[PDB]
Amino acid sequence: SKLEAILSQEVEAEIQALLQEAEAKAEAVKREAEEKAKALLQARERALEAQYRAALRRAESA
Amino acid sequence: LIKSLAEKEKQLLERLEAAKKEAEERVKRAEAEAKALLE
Amino acid sequence: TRQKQELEEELALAQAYLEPLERLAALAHGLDKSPFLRVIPFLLTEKELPLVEEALRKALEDRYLLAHEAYAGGVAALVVVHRKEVDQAKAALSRAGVAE
């Protein structure tokens, strides 16, 4: 059936657009949470490192 | 040739459900990825 | 009196399109309201179905099914092509002379 076979191929193009959005959503979430993983890594590292460093400074000074 | 529209409307609904399965698999995939990120 | 007039009008309206709507729904037993294609049934005259099917031949090849399977008195020429393309084809059939 010609024209509603074309309508069902538009439906397969909607499947195509949905899997495009699926891969795009997976990569977007992975990228933004990778940014946050590295940022929180460096954040807690440098914060506790600065606390450790200032404790060493004030300890040797005292 | 009316039954052709009938049965390919049925399998049109089936193609929508194929896309739906792809969607929900992608969503729980990204959820498990964010779970590994939090861990 | 209002109820009797309404019941008489309902019986008069049901006396004409009982067999034709049932025949169209029987041919269209799976293609009624699924969101792919409309099916414009036009209660037309006897077998001048090619004069209406000229617009369907102007439409898609293995579709734009414009034919009358039953209701030999008033031929329920169902035309099924698409939604928007079948709306344009219904305009073309009305240009050829048709009424759904």
Curated annotation (Swiss-Prot), chain A:
Give GO MF terms, alphabetically. Answer: ATP binding; proton-transporting ATP synthase activity, rotational mechanism; proton-transporting ATPase activity, rotational mechanism
Q: Which organism is it from?
A: Thermus thermophilus (strain ATCC 27634 / DSM 579 / HB8)
Tell me which family the UniProt entry assigns to this protein: Belongs to the V-ATPase E subunit family.
Top-level taxonomy: Bacteria, Thermotogati, Deinococcota, Deinococci, Thermales
Protein name per Swiss-Prot or TrEMBL? V-type ATP synthase subunit E
What is the recorded function of this protein according to its Swiss-Prot or TrEMBL entry? Produces ATP from ADP in the presence of a proton gradient across the membrane.
The gene designation is atpE
The domain of life is: Bacteria
Keyword Ion transport on this protein?
A: yes
Q: Kindly state one GO CC term assigned in the UniProt record.
A: proton-transporting two-sector ATPase complex, catalytic domain
What keywords does the record list, in alphabetical order? ATP synthesis, Hydrogen ion transport, Ion transport, Transport
Q: Which residues of the full protein are shown?
A: 2 to 63 of 188
Which biological process annotations from GO are given for this protein? proton motive force-driven plasma membrane ATP synthesis
From the UniProt annotation, give the residues forming the signal peptide: none
